[PDB]
Design a protein around this ligand. Structure first.
Ligand SMILES: [Mg+2]
Ligand SMILES: [Mg+2]
Ligand SMILES: [Mg+2]
Ligand SMILES: [Mg+2]
Ligand SMILES: [Zn+2]
Ligand SMILES: [Zn+2]
Lengths: 176, 80, 222, 97, 38, 162, 45, 131
RNA sequence: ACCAUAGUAGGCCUAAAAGCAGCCAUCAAUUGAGAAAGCGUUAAAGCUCAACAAAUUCACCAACAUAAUCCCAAAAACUAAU
């Protein structure tokens, strides 16, 4: 009938928007989809996002295909940061080692894209490096003993200063 | 809705590879278990046109990208 | 299948501070109290100043003579500023601000009574002079595209030229003048006073060589 | 391909193109096969069966279209151009069916 | 139809055809793009 | 030349492409090194609208012109020949190069007006009601400006506007 | 130098002369040579 | 016209010729198929099935491939390279598996190819699969 | 004509910003496709451009209404013209 992509949580598969109405319009029940998703991903840590593909057939039958989580989430978890940087390149949010990049590439090689495209891990590592560049995360060759925490402290103070500046700008705009 | 870690646990292992409920995080295997060519990739600025030699596919891929960029810039003004 | 050609890269050119065109005053800071005669020789003939590129790579070339006033200056400024990219382009004036006063009668419409009253100021422009000069990290196609509008809206005929285009047209004019087939030319006849044509000609025609007629310039007249 | 896609090929049963690639006058038939076996033509009707018969000694490239009007359109293309073949096929499809 | 001295295509579907001694911008998707050279 | 033939029998249609013999170029061109047909047969600036023996060499049987990539002409010669074919068709030359319509040939119309050297289409010209005075005279175009380079034995330039 | 013409099975009637000459070589030798040949092929393959 | 201004051969065409020569010299099985324009997911699935048997496919421009073909010893493959072309490149030729996996799609025709400097048609590949 | 898949909904802001209110980066998968040059959606979707694969005649700007008693010589594109 069509192709449906959805970013769904591991266990927080609610029958509400913005996913319930689409499947209801398609015709399949949403309770069955939520139950199937929960039983299939009951062994996955609840809270993480993951892309999935839903196939709807005439007579209102559905099937679920689930891929690996987003590289954004992978790299943010590796760097220990909650949110990415605003000004990419000019500011840096965290540091991810080439070793972490290789681990992420190995764990994500078993996805639909890189499975159908049988390519060496070098291509996946380069893709992860580009994703980190977009994320604003620098990729140092081999440097993590305590400078990671040293950079974490200054990143925290910079984030606090940025929050204060944003609050001041919002207050000035409101008073203007 | 997961959680990250502040201490040296980041420097001792990664927090993204572990997806299943069990905390079977992978250890940091040394160079004796990791490929040597992994640590020999350009992680800084991307390779430039004057840096790439004209006898590789990378040079022509970059040239094609630059040509597409030039066409987009010159066709920014869409008369029709 | 088509070949891959290299693209031009601009790194040596530097965008200066304030790349936008500067605001120009309608009247000079010190107004001209004395009313001056309207010399039309500041329009007649070819231009001797601001005929060559100084810092930019593109320009608006004037193929005729005329007067530029504050309306034209504001039009050029607004159009170029709104259609030009400040991050990769810069523009400069090549004509001074309006300084020549123009008088209108006003009180009383009958002939005589004295000179009129100063109404507005104009900048005289001759044929072959650059008006606005631009440069930066850009190609000629887009600059020509958004400068043709300014050239059309200018009073005198104008073109959006570049260094290469200006050199090409000058060389084409030189080639036409050197390979002209007929032995009879305006310059030769005027200088030799053949047929007594100096009676109907002008003392400035010896210099104009028949290519300039009043404020109009015909580039195809050799 | 676009012309066939914008025609509604829902009323076509089987299209079989039989040719010899080693000949010198099968280029038009091969281009016709490529145009008629495109993704848009596939998706505009799924029950249609497209067959590509390859021979070496046949020396006569031909196309056969059987459709549910009990109708058979056979075109032996040895000098016919691909564009003319496509136009004739489209005209016949929009005429009958 | 608008009678103009300069004809320009306002989209990709405008086609220029010479009829009755004049030039015409004809448009089927946007009929308001109909222009006639004066 | 190639022809397409259609056969219908029992709700079955078969179309066949038949190749028949076609005339070839004459063995001895006066200027064999020319890259262009007219310009190597030395007909440049030599034909007019009335040279139907040359104008009908490459036109479709229904009066349409043939593509340049097929004929082989240079661009200027192709344009000149196209204009000459148009002028001949309007003048009435080449009477067998029209489509056959038995249903439309029966309702005869007003007799055709004789004409020649007609530049514009007969249905696209408006009468000149004002015609101007001597200083601003509205002239009637005759012939085409593409043929202004033809050889003139008398030496007088052709009057393309009268 | 060039390759073959790729004959098909619609009119397959000509075979390469290599197999025929190999058959002739096989037939033009004695039983001792046959024994040595088959034992050598057994030992190798 | 004046004599020919011989256009210099650029790095792109040089590298394409080098890759074509490497393909024609290294591997043994070189099949030729007609490239039918279908969905990219179907293309990816086809490459997936082909790489199950570790035999690849390549696409090269005709403007570069035809002069190389007529200059090399493969001048008998000229009729196979007019339209959209696919070069199935294989070491240790296994035509049986290729036929088995290409039989699923009915309208991809095997134009022909060569196995160890032996040109074979679709009937030849059928024979090799039967072997 | 010719098809346009990928990490990925790049990162922030935002109810939503998926190439396209906006700011910063502009890497990378494929033989070949810009974190996207125009339409379109609230946001998606979808329609095109450039990209590869196929052939490739030629292709940069240039055209612009009218007045009053009644239009205003008639007509003519080739017999030799400093
Ligand atoms: Mg003007
Ligand atoms: Mg690539
Ligand atoms: Mg395209
Ligand atoms: Mg009016
Ligand atoms: Zn339009
Ligand atoms: Zn010619």
């Amino acid at each position: 009938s069509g192709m449906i992509r959805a970013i769904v949580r591991a266990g927080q598969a609610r029958p509400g928007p913005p996913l319930g109405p689409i499947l209801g319009q398609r015709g399949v029940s949403i309770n069955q989809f939520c139950k199937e998703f929960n039983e299939k991903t009951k062994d996955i840590k609840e809270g993480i996002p993951l892309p999935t593909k839903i196939f709807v057939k005439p007579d209102r039958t559905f099937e679920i295909k689930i891929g690996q989580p987003t590289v954004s989430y992978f790299l943010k978890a590796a760097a220990g940061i909650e949110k990415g940087a605003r000004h990419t390149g000019k500011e840096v949010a965290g540091l991810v080692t080439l070793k972490h990049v290789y681990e992420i590439a190995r764990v994500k090689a078993q996805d639909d894209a890189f499975a159908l495209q049988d390519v060496p891990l070098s291509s996946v590592v380069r893709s992860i490096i580009g994703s980190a560049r977009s994320l604003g995360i620098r990729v140092v060759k081999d440097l993590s003993s305590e400078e990671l925490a040293a950079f974490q402290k200054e990143r925290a103070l910079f984030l606090a200063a940025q929050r204060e500046a944003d609050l001041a700008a919002q207050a000035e705009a409101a008073k203007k | 809705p997961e959680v990250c870690t502040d201490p040296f646990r980041l420097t001792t292992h990664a927090m993204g590879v572990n997806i299943y409920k069990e905390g079977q995080d992978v250890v940091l295997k040394p160079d004796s278990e990791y490929p040597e060519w992994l640590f020999e990739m350009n992680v800084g600025p991307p390779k430039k046109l004057e840096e790439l030699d004209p006898e590789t596919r990378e040079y022509w891929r970059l040239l094609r990208k630059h040509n597409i960029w030039r066409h987009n810039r010159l066709s920014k003004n869409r008369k029709f | 299948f088509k070949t891959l050609l290299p693209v031009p890269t601009f790194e040596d050119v530097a965008i200066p501070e304030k790349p936008k065109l500067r605001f120009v005053e309608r009247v000079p800071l010190v107004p001209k109290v004395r009313r001056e005669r309207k010399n039309l020789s500041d329009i007649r003939g070819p231009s001797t100043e601001a005929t060559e590129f100084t810092e930019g790579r593109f320009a608006i070339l004037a193929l005729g003579g005329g007067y530029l006033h504050w309306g034209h200056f504001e039009m050029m400024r607004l159009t170029i500023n709104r259609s030009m990219d400040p991050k990769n382009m810069f523009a400069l004036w090549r004509v001074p601000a309006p300084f020549k006063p123009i008088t209108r009668k006003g009180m009383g419409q009958r002939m005589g009574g004295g000179k009129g009253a100063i109404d507005h100021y104009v900048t005289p422009v001759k044929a072959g002079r650059l008006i606005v000069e631009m440069g930066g990290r850009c190609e000629f196609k887009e600059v020509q595209g958004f400068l043709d509008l300014v050239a059309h809206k200018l009073p005198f005929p104008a073109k959006a030229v570049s260094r290469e285009t200006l050199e090409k047209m000058r060389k084409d004019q030189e080639e036409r003048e050197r390979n002209n087939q007929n032995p009879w030319t305006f310059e030769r006849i005027a200088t030799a006073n053949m047929l007594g044509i100096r009676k109907v000609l002008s003392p400035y025609d010896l210099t104009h060589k028949g290519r300039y007629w009043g404020k109009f310039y015909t580039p195809e007249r050799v | 391909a676009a012309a066939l896609a914008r025609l509604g090929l829902r009323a076509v049963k089987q299209v079989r193109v039989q040719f010899c690639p080693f000949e010198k006058n099968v280029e038009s038939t091969r281009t016709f096969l490529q145009a008629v076996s495109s993704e848009k033509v596939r998706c505009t009707n799924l029950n249609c069966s497209v067959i590509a018969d390859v021979r070496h000694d046949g020396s006569e490239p031909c196309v056969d279209v059987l459709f549910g009007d009990g109708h058979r359109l056979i075109m032996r293309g040895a000098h016919l151009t691909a564009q003319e073949m496509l136009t004739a096929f489209a005209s016949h499809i929009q005429a009958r069916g | 139809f608008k009678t103009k001295g300069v004809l320009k295509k306002r989209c990709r579907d405008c086609y220029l055809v010479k009829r009755r001694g004049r030039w015409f911008i004809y448009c089927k998707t946007n009929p308001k793009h109909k222009q006639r050279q004066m | 030349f190639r022809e397409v033939v259609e056969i219908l029998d029992g709700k079955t249609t078969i179309i066949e492409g038949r190749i028949t013999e076609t005339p070839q170029e004459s063995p001895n061109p006066p200027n064999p090194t020319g890259q262009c047909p007219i310009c190597r047969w030395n007909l440049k600036h030599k034909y007019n609208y009335e040279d139907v023996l040359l104008l009908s060499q490459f036109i479709r049987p229904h009066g349409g012109m043939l593509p340049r990539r097929i004929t082989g002409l240079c661009q200027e010669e192709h344009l000149k020949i196209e204009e000459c074919v148009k002028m001949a068709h309007r003048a009435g030359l080449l009477p067998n190069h029209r489509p056959k319509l038995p249903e439309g040939f029966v309702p005869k119309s007003k007799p055709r007006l004789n004409r020649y050297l007609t530049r514009w289409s007969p249905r696209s010209v408006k009468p000149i009601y004002n015609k101007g005075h001597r200083w601003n005279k509205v002239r009637m175009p005759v012939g085409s400006p593409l043929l202004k380079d033809n050889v003139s034995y008398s030496g007088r330039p052709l009057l393309l506007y009268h | 130098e060039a390759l073959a013409g790729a004959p098909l099975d619609n009119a397959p009637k000509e075979y390469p002369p290599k197999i025929q000459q190999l058959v002739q070589d096989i037939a033009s030798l004695t039983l001792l040579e046959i024994s040595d040949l088959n034992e050598l092929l057994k030992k190798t393959l | 016209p004046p004599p020919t201004p011989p256009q210099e051969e650029t790095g792109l065409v040089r590298l394409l010729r080098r890759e074509i020569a490497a393909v024609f010299r290294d591997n043994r099985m070189i099949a030729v198929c007609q490239h039918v324009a279908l969905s990219a997911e179907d293309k990816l699935l086809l490459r997936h099935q082909l790489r199950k048997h570790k035999i690849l496919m390549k696409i090269f421009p005709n403007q570069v491939l035809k002069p190389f073909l007529e200059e090399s010893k493969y001048q008998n493959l000229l009729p196979l390279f007019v339209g959209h072309n696919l070069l199935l490149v294989s070491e240790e030729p296994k035509v049986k598996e290729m036929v088995r996996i290409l039989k699923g799609i009915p309208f991809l025709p095997l134009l022909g190819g060569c196995i160890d400097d032996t040109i074979l048609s679709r009937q030849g590949f059928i024979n090799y699969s039967k072997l």
